[PDB]
Nucleic acid binder design. Structure first.
Lengths: 164, 154, 97, 53, 87, 24, 61, 135
RNA sequence: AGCUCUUGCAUUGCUGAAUUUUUUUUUUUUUUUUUUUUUUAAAAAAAAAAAAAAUUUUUUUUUUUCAAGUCAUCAUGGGGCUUAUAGAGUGGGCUACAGGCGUAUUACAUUGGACACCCACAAGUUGCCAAAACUGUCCGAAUAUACGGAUUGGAGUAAAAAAAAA
């Protein structure tokens, strides 16, 4: 019971496009029934490829070096986004995914990844006794992504708890 | 059904694109969309004597609450002469008040067009046609010109 | 120009780390000590390097020695930003619209 | 006499209790220690202390 | 600025304690304190008492001697060290 | 001042009617 | 008054504008942000082919 | 041998870069035309080296229709400064082959620059290049 | 080796100006017919016909001249400097104030001021937030008005919410 979200950031639409297509190839390979003989596949209708617009902000400059206050010119940064959606139930192929994105290097393009997943929780027996139903899936971990030699293939990975 | 391209690019100094159609849905309730500003709106038309007229949830006379703006809402409806008999269900987004009015006016016009073909303009026959309401179908997609990258300089 | 002298000022903000100064600032922003804040603030901003408070930094450019008209948008200064921009040796900042 | 609904403030840290009505879910987040697992330890203790109510 | 710590006069105070070898303010009410006091900074505030003190304040070109009296007690010393743009 | 000091209008001109968000 | 239970549950307090000195601790530190701002090579790269003196060599002639 | 030097340049980046290790990827130019500022620094390092302008523009033109119709559409090279022997006024000079449409935004196109420093003083060099659609 | 020392009439670079308008008329795809190069084949060439059309929120982009400006952006030719034209440290000054000039804002009210309103709808949900006004109420005496808000003194202060017991 694991859910994966991959967010992807770029400057040239070419590179974020190739990134989206190659990770889509990886997902479909990663849960691929390559042979019939074992038959719990997740193409449930959660699955998407949601595209996204950007953060419109223009940053302008003086053209001239000295007096030149007539001399303006406009400049501009672009960020292009996609999100990649899947989820699955066994962990060994999830590890194949994480090691797959560990190997294939992508040019100029940020990988931010969301991994909400189920993980079991010990309780002191007092609160289990004093239990005797809603979602309450609240871990939401957080990690840094810079100033320590990483050009941002950061993985964030909130967690979902279960203790009935 | 066979709808077609209805859109226009009427304006000066900045273009426009309202790619949304107007169409009748199988509930007997047509739906249409209209923007005349970058602020935008949609409509949904039921032939009914129920709640009457509705944008943004509320009855209209408190949301829009300048009278001139209210007849800017009602102007295609008053031009039609088919005022009462439809429930008017509608949604809006953006901008400023009578821009919302004339936008929702255009959308109401489009829904009325798919209700009655000859009153207003459509793409049923090659994106052409003529009725009293055919003038205000194609939206007036002029926006503000951009604040000039340059000087007052005076 | 003198980009490095400011780096020396930044290094003094961090060699005499700002934590020591700010912790003394904590006890002067506390109203809980009834007094002695005047004694704590009497020294401790004078024994502490006066050139290590965070206002003496002036945020110069890094390419050149620009001290005026800098940008934290991409850590450069306007004329260089334009030169690199037209060259395109910068992360995808194109002429706008 | 006007303020934004989303204060989105700063100069502090917390456990950020929050609820999402869209999916009927509570949300608590991590902020204190550098590593993720130390924060998992702190919020796990906070979850146990949450159930003392 | 009275909130959270209202007074700053540290170097002035070092010179004041140098004066305070027999009396800070004529405890031995005031007798002009003939030893000159010459500060090097005018950002200093003025503290209650401090009367009859010969203060020499810097103007950027020299030291300006002014005797303090009862009215200038709630002031900051730089108000008495101008740049002399008379005309 | 367009009623800069004491109005419900000129204090949006002096940036105070928008109360400043706590940031640093 | 229910948030008192949520408060003592979570140990929180009004963060801005109270003058109790806590804001100077809970503020983020700018010390990393101040010294990563510059970038100066030493003018003599220990690897090889230092350009900052090659320009001097070219303009010597 | 080679493989000492492979690891040497690879480590030379590696210790320089702080964190990561970085391959080295030399792909080499097979002319002076396929790049613009490569041609520009050929101009500037020529112009330091006492080349008179005529032999420069000679070798450029000979190389130009030596590679006629293949990868170069048009060449315009301008230099500003003092070029000659007794130039003392500020001046510029050039030459241009073919037609370039610098107003045409569908042009695969390039800009070049370089700088030279003669015995008189400093220079300015700009090179503008247009290509056929084989790219 | 270092200049914030000079020289923009020694310069590179970059820009100013109005030269304010021109940036669509041009190709490409397909068809038919035919011919140029190479020991089973592609381009090429030529006659004609039809369609596709020309980048971005719509401005940027293409443009001729002034020894126009800048050595204090860096650079750099020449000249100058090196008990000082080099660096620090502390405090000024870079913001001074007969006059005069340029650029803006705010008004001189009633189409308005004030106060409330719902706290009206935006640009702006991508990896929620206004004002003018609309609606209500107070004001119209050359009052310099309850318009206007410049100068000047003075001071840095209120609470509201609700719980348990007698």
């Amino acid at each position: 019971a694991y859910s994966v979200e991959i967010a992807v950031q770029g400057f040239e639409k070419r590179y974020v496009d190739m990134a989206c297509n190659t990770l889509g190839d990886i997902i479909i390979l990663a849960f691929a029934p390559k042979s019939y003989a074992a038959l719990n596949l997740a193409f449930g209708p959660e699955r998407r490829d949601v595209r996204l617009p950007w953060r419109r902000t223009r940053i302008t400059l003086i053209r001239g070096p000295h007096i030149d206050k007539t001399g303006m010119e406009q400049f501009e940064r672009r960020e292009y986004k996609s999100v990649l959606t899947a989820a699955t139930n066994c962990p060994q192929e999830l590890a194949r995914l994480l090691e797959a994105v560990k190997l294939y290097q992508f040019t100029g393009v940020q990988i931010k990844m969301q991994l909400a997943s189920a993980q079991r929780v010990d309780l002191p027996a007092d609160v289990s006794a004093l239990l005797r139903x809603x979602x309450x899936x609240x871990x939401x971990x957080x990690x840094x992504x810079x100033x320590x030699x990483x050009x941002x293939x950061x993985x964030x990975x909130x967690x979902x708890x279960x203790x009935x | 059904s066979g709808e077609a391209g209805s859109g226009l690019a009427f304006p000066a100094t900045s273009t426009s694109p309202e790619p949304a159609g107007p169409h009748i849905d199988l509930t007997g309730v047509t739906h249409a969309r209209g923007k005349r500003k970058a602020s935008a709106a949609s409509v949904q038309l039921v032939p009914a004597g129920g709640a009457g007229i509705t944008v943004n949830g509320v009855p209209l006379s408190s949301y829009f609450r300048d009278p001139a703006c209210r007849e800017k809402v009602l102007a295609p409806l008053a031009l039609a002469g088919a005022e009462t008999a439809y429930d008017v269900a509608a949604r809006v987004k953006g901008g400023g008040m009578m821009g919302q009015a004339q936008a929702i006016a255009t959308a109401l016009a489009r829904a009325l067009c798919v209700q009655q073909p000859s009153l207003g303009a459509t793409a049923g026959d090659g994106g052409n046609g003529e009725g009293p309401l055919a003038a205000m179908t194609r939206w007036d997609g002029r926006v503000v010109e951009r604040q000039k990258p340059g000087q007052a300089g005076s | 120009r003198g980009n490095v002298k400011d780096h020396m000022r930044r290094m003094l903000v961090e060699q005499h780390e700002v934590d020591r100064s700010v912790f003394k600032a904590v006890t002067t922003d506390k109203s809980v000590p009834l007094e002695h804040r005047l004694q704590v603030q009497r020294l401790f901003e004078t024994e502490v390097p006066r050139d290590s408070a965070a206002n003496r930094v002036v945020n110069r450019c890094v390419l050149t020695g620009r001290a005026r008209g800098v940008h934290r948008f991409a850590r450069l200064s306007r004329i260089m930003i334009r030169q690199l921009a037209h060259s395109g040796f910068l992360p995808g900042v194109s002429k706008a619209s | 006499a006007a303020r934004a609904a989303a204060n989105a403030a700063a100069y502090p840290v917390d456990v950020e209790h929050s609820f999402c009505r869209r999916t009927r879910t509570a949300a608590l987040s991590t902020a204190r220690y550098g590593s993720r697992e130390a924060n998992r330890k702190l919020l796990l203790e906070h979850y146990n202390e949450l159930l003392r109510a | 600025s009275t909130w959270k710590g209202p007074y700053v006069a540290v170097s002035l105070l070092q010179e004041v304690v140098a004066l305070a070898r027999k009396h800070p303010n004529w405890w031995n009410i005031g007798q002009k304190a003939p030893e000159v006091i010459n500060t090097y900074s005018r950002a200093s505030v003025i503290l209650p008492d401090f009367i009859a003190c010969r203060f020499g304040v810097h103007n950027g070109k020299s030291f300006v001697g002014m005797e303090v009296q009862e009215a200038m007690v709630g002031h900051r010393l730089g108000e008495f060290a101008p740049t002399k743009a008379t005309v | 001042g367009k009623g800069d000091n004491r109005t419900r209008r000129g204090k949006i001109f002096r940036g105070t009617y928008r109360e400043q968000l706590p940031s640093h | 008054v229910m948030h008192r239970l949520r408060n003592t549950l979570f140990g929180r307090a009004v963060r801005p504008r109270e003058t109790t000195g806590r804001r100077a601790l809970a503020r983020p530190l700018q010390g990393k942000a101040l010294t990563d701002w510059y970038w100066m090579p030493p003018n003599e790269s220990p690897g090889f082919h230092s350009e900052e003196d090659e320009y001097e060599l070219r303009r010597a002639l | 041998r080679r493989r000492e030097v492979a690891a040497l340049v690879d480590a030379a980046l590696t210790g320089a870069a702080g964190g990561q290790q970085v391959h080295f990827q030399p792909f080499v130019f097979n002319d002076i035309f396929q790049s613009a500022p490569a041609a520009a620094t050929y101009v500037a390092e020529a112009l330091e080296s006492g080349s008179a302008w005529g032999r420069i523009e000679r070798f450029f033109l000979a190389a130009a229709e030596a590679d006629a119709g293949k990868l170069v559409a048009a060449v315009r090279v301008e230099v500003a400064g003092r070029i000659g022997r007794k130039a003392d006024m500020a001046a510029t000079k050039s030459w241009a082959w073919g037609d370039l449409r610098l107003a045409s935004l569908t042009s695969k196109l390039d800009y070049g620059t370089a700088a030279a420093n003669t015995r008189m003083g400093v220079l300015g060099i700009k090179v503008w290049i247009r290509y056929q659609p084989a790219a």
